[PDB]
Amino acid sequence: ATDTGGYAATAGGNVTGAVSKTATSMQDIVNIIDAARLDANGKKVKGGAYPLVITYTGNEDSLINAAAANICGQWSKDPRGVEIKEFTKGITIIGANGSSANFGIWIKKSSDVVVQNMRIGYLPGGAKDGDMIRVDDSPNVWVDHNELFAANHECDGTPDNDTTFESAVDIKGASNTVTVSYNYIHGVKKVGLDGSSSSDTGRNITYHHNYYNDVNARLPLQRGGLVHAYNNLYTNITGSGLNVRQNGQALIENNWFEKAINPVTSRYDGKNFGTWVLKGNNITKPADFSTYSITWTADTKPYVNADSWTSTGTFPTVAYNYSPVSAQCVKDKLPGYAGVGKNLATLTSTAC
Ligand SMILES: [Ca+2]
């Protein structure tokens, strides 16, 4: 009921008294959430009046296909997103099979929100924080079985030469417990941070059963706190993978890395390096780097790469319950469980 396979423990809107609503457009979602704040007398209730299970049936493929054809025209447009602000009664946004969105979901100062089966891609507004999914000051959030994509490319003349597209799953502030699972993330330059700055440290986040393909960096860019990454399939990482900074701790287990540059590193600050515990991945020693095409580069400032492929620290006892399959099974089976239209199916050893 509340088990997500990670630090977040929430059933979202699937609780007692939940009200099911169907949203056929972005605006419907905005309107549904707004109406969910009113009590029987028409007065607003802090945190929302009742739980919601919104089934999104809209399809914005036309906007997505047009954007795919003109990648560089996106960054300067207005960003589009549904804001879930200060809603704590519990909410679940689930896309219907065949649904799609060219707008993001921005969660802020909320809790107990689940977003599932949403296909989001090529969002406008990279220069104005056009994130696909943003989790800000929001604990108990579960981002599961979604497809988040764009083009892993940077156009010229974009602000900071970094705004062609914004991130897939940015997590910041007091989002103390979050689970990111079964997501198919592809064609994304900046996957997502875990802390917006050097001072925004903390949180306990779990990334599991995600399928990353053709992504440049931030898987995540971790700032302190704890990160548990298990059963993820990392392929074609063009910049760096897990960047553990500000003394953060990471447990990296039973993942499959392939064709990746700097898969596990601590760079860009020049100090306060994070640590990692490595176990059960397809890579077990440096000899495997050649086998799976793992490349390492240096950085202009002091850095630490996992080129020795050894644990550099410790990790506290993982609270929740979980059962990872083998790194091989991930590589063989994960692409069929990750993403939309998989009916929220999960990979078990039985299926291996
Ligand atoms: Ca962002």
Swiss-Prot record:
One annotated Gene Ontology cellular component of this protein: extracellular region
Catalysed reaction equations from the record: Eliminative cleavage of (1->4)-alpha-D-galacturonan to give oligosaccharides with 4-deoxy-alpha-D-galact-4-enuronosyl groups at their non-reducing ends
GO biological process per UniProt: pectin catabolic process
Cofactor: Ca(2+)
Catalytic residue positions: R218
Stretches assigned to coiled coil: none
Protein location: Secreted
Keywords: Calcium, Disulfide bond, Lyase, Metal-binding, Secreted, Signal, Virulence
Matching SMART domains: Amb_all
Cofactor comment: Binds 1 Ca(2+) ion per subunit.
Top-level taxon: Bacteria
InterPro entries: Pec_lyase (IPR002022), Pectin_lyas_fold (IPR012334), Pectin_lyase_fold/virulence (IPR011050), PEL (IPR045032)
GO molecular function, one term: metal ion binding
Pathway(s) this gene product operates in, as recorded in its UniProt entry: Glycan metabolism; pectin degradation; 2-dehydro-3-deoxy-D-gluconate from pectin: step 2/5
The keyword Transport belongs to this UniProt entry's keyword annotation: no
Residues given in the record as Ca(2+) binding sites: D129, D131, E166, D170
The protein's enzyme class: lyase
Disulfide bond residue pairs: C72-C155, C329-C352
EC number(s) reported in the record: 4.2.2.2
One Pfam short name: Pectate_lyase_4
Biological function: Involved in maceration and soft-rotting of plant tissue.
Family listed: Belongs to the polysaccharide lyase 1 family. PLADES subfamily.
UniProt-recorded name of the protein: Pectate lyase C
The organism of origin for this protein: Dickeya chrysanthemi (Pectobacterium chrysanthemi)
